[PDB]
Symmetry: C4
Subunit: 388 residues, 4 copies
């Protein structure tokens, strides 16, 4: 086995096709399905799997009561076979904690889980299913990381962490790991003013992360990482097509180097693929809440502060609940290009549906096609009333 290198460009994205869907909430109405949130997808050279943070209880279990709570001792990063639901009997625990990332380097997988109280959290870095390195909180305020997969190049896997306020300046660091060991870390540089929950992907040009500014911005900050030099830059998506949630309406001039104003102290994890004319942005349809999901083709969105959509695709109707979204790719697929993929977390229960006492989600996932495929919509599909 050799370390994977990012030698390909993105495939041309002309539409999106269904990749995976687990229908976890539907099935968990009458099966031993774990309560989760913060899901993602990540590939090994021989298999792609769903990932999420378990809450250490099933949905029908009485301990599902109170699972809106983010950071208990009963959480763990689990993985399970593609499009199966996360069950007690098929879920593999990768590490223990309430914030995570994970990625395969071509030889083995690195998984990182953070646990602890708000003022004393720590990250444990696992490699090849063994703990290798640990990182203590540096700002004593909820050390946290991506909640989707990291990306590796020739054994080097960069990860973005934040420690500090969610409603003001915080201390963001980019760590560079190899075989679980810390090669280097850097403080955040560039014009991004607040960074959380980065969604990353890699291609020949380097590693691109689309993150969330929770403090002031409804445009998304972007971190661009060179995994060879182990250096990075940051800014915002220049486009006036704003992609955080909640957010103001789309203006005609975006902001490249500062938060676009209107909504403070809020946001959702999201993603984009930034690739010149081949650029596609994901966002919730609603500007007010986590409902609906759509992809928009916005040429040069990263660098053009006037850029508007020229094509799109609805993924989830506005009538249906969405949630977190993030990027991943099968870096070990055949062919001459990397096929862009993403998942959308479909949150059910609290706070929006409070007849039940739990919060969970299911997953839908798409990858790009060079065809111009017809579109459908992909709801969670569970009837909340069945759980009453």
């Amino acid at each position: 086995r050799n370390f994977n290198n990012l030698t390909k460009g993105l495939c041309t994205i002309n539409s999106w096709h269904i990749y995976g869907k687990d229908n976890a909430v539907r099935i968990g109405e009458s099966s031993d399905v774990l309560v989760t949130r913060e899901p993602y997808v990540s590939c090994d050279p021989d298999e792609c799997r769903f990932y999420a943070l378990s809450q250490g209880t099933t949905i029908r279990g009485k301990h599902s009561n109170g699972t809106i709570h983010d950071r208990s001792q009963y959480r763990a990063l689990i993985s399970w076979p593609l499009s199966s639901p996360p069950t007690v009997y098929n879920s593999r625990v990768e590490c223990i904690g309430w914030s995570s990332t994970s990625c395969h380097d071509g030889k083995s997988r690195m998984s990182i889980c953070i646990s602890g109280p708000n003022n004393n959290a720590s990250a444990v870095v696992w490699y090849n299913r063994r703990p290798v390195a640990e990182i203590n909180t540096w700002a004593r305020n909820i050390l946290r990381t991506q909640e989707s997969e990291c990306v590796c190049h020739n054994g080097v896997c960069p990860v973005v962490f934040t420690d500090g306020s969610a409603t003001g300046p915080a201390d963001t660091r980019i760590y560079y790991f190899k075989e679980g060991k810390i090669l280097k870390w850097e403080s955040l540089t560039g014009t991004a003013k607040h960074i959380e929950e980065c969604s990353c992907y890699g291609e020949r040009t380097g590693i691109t992360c689309t993150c969330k500014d929770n403090w002031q911005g409804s445009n998304r900050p972007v971190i661009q990482i060179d995994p060879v030099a182990m250096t990075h830059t940051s800014q915002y998506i220049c486009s006036p097509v704003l992609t955080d949630n909640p957010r103001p309406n789309d203006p005609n001039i975006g902001k490249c180097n500062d938060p676009y104003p209107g909504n403070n102290n809020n946001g959702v994890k999201g993603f984009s693929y930034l690739d010149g004319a081949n650029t596609w942005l994901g966002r919730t349809i609603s500007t007010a809440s986590r409902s609906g999901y759509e992809m928009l083709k916005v040429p040069n969105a990263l660098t053009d502060d006037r850029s508007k959509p020229i094509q799109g695709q609805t993924i989830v109707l506005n009538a249906d609940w969405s949630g977190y979204s993030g990027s991943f790719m099968d870096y070990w697929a055949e062919g001459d290009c990397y096929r862009a993929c993403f998942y959308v977390e479909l949150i059910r229960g609290r706070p929006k549906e409070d007849k039940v006492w739990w919060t969970s989600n299911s997953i839908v996932s798409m990858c790009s096609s060079t065809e111009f495929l017809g579109q459908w919509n992909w709801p969670d599909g569970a009837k909340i009333e069945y759980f009453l």
Copy 2:
């Protein structure tokens, strides 16, 4: 690993022996068994498995209500170990959608799932568990495919698709795939006037598909495919032993090149083995509904419009519900001939049993023997009243 070639003829069929049975509805009365329909069987070089379209809920789950519905976003092609039932915990998702086919080429498996609304459906072709190619609807009217396994020769795997009306002329295409990539496609030629849900098998003479004419015919159309030249012909089974359902009574002269009349806009997926004097046809016992199942030895059924049975075997009593049936073979078995096999879908619930609000099925499967074996009958075996 090498691509499989179809180098053998069919084994002489003198009777049928039990191959597999999952008793899924019996077991699912008190286990986490997924609601399914449209099942089949398909072999890898090292394992044979059951396949079906899940409905994304268990039978005892409240979401089983309404599963007579064919095309929801909650369906997926799943596979599971031979004769086990399709459970939440043992089912492997092959792809997402509501119409499918799947086959192994000797090196890896190709699976195809179609999803979307009626006017905007698309097929995604997976190879070696990765998406490779996509096909958009060409007639904007429920793009659909075999619902049983495809067959490969030297890496080339033909698949029959239909897009268009189920009650009039439609647009049928034969696609030729290799490693998931589209080599070629052709429009339907020959005398078959309507094609749906082809059941296929391969042998030295080529690939033979027995399909369903949903429009006018109660005889079954046949497509014969040369996977080397990538060409095909079509006609109907000439025999007056009619094998669709519902159907008229058997006449003494069948039809080779046109639908045999009596029943319009209806039918069921079925199969046959067409091999000269070694020819066997499957059919429901009832001419009116999907009940019972029998095999009939009808010499030269394909080409002889006077041909009648000279031997038979009851598989399911007329008193018991049947459903879809299709062909498969273990192409990787030892010996000098390919042993013909088939499955029968045993549908339970709606529309025939409407005290329950669900529709599901179990599977029974047989393969041929050169012995003249005693016959039994093989009902689903569940008591519907237990579910009330």
Copy 3:
């Protein structure tokens, strides 16, 4: 991989140690455990597993009602990991039917399942998980076989079948298989007057089967098979220590060549290890019913019509239900001798416990030790009242 040869003698048996126990009925009170009966144990070169005939329902499932019934279409031979219970989610179906045997030859496993109505039953012989050969009923009266493992030598695996009356002379055949193919079969010869449900083991001297005479005898018939010459002899255990159930009290002179009288048209599957001074017999403690189980060291029991016990070990107290028992050995274990093993089926439910409507069992299993180990007793352990 090479075919296994029987090159070793039996280890000296000085006591019996616990080998496996699944507690299936206890666990199945609140888990998806399949209803079974007729269990056994059999080893592969890399794993040993529990086997049994499923009834195609769980114990808590409503379809458990009526499972005293022996021969439904819903039965299958399943295998599952040693000492785990037979669950819906961990059980592997070997073949479909209501009477079975199975054994590994060193390269692959042969499994045989019989199905059909009483007058038209057939055996299907599977090898390396594929059907290879089939055998039609020859007496049209419940074709049936061992219900425990067969034994192989240099690829040749003999199996004992019976077709015909259970209450009079029947037609017993010994079949000799290699890679699932029929090499040869012989009609029963020797002085055994009725043969059912043979329990077999192999060692350098050949293959020894201890069976059940259901017609007239309460001593057990024995078949001795030479797997090289493919020939056999038969007689009864000469010892007056009678080992069938029900049975008369032990006399002081046994019978070598005829049924010992007292109980007609009844019996239970059992076993023995016949090895000169190293001879041990298994039996129920009760002479009237299937309760208790004990092993008795009876020197030269096979050939000495005066032989009595000189040592023993209680396995199951008379107060607890037992049932079928049979032999197996790990032929792939390290060392210079084959360690004798056996299982006892612990039947719960009907007919003896009729407050419940089901019949099932759990398994306990022992192997021999060269130590003189202390003895315990090994009940099923379920409380029947919990199921009411």
Copy 4:
């Protein structure tokens, strides 16, 4: 594969990080989780797993009633994937019995289970999943062993057994196994006056076991084993930081060669890492009951009868139930040192929580870090009232 040799020293322990946690009781409120107690953790060269003694019933099962009982015929040593809970469907049975140990030698795993009545118990030694050797009770009074992993060096795996009184002098033996075979055994020598439930680990200096004196001592006895010479010594931890439970308050002078007095006929399994200035002791926080858990850095605790803590870490709050604790290490990890690990059994139910009729546990586990990591606390997390 080669036998593992203990060639490394312990990593410097500056804090403890979360390693694993299964949340078994939470999940088992609504899943098929087996009732357990006496858990531990042990690594293979390619995987680390949780181990425990099942009670042969699930928690929600009616047979959970009475599981405070220690030694039934329904117990077995099971193992299951790291941080998953012990379920009916994912648990692998290693052997049958009510007291156990297990360890991998680099080539294969040895597991030992003891079963029987109090006066006639026996150990069966399994190697590479086969029974190899057996040991009969020598004192006829509950033959028993470690309840956590053993340790191997160049194929030699020492195990500590005790047979005899729990409230007076007993007969302790150290056995030395290789490939499951008994190389040698010795009677206990040294100044330890009573030995139970040893927790062991290995490093270049040899094998160190921290045990429980159930008779008179609230300091812990220590056995130090040379696996090459196959010899041992024993004493107590000299430190006045007392680590049994229940126990007196900490004095200023401990005892090196005799039980520290105050509490008779009681105790709990525990552990320590004894490594000069790198020494850490585990203990319950409460002196009266099995509640809370803490690690204390006590330099030269083994040899210094005045030694006090200079650093510590809370693992479980005093408000939460703890239980057994023991040592293990991943001997096959990369790097230049062995990373010290431990687990704590979190007992729920009887006797402390008698509203329920069962006794079970969950597991939390930590390994050492060279960082000074922030601390959290790790409760079982189940709400007992949910089970009423």
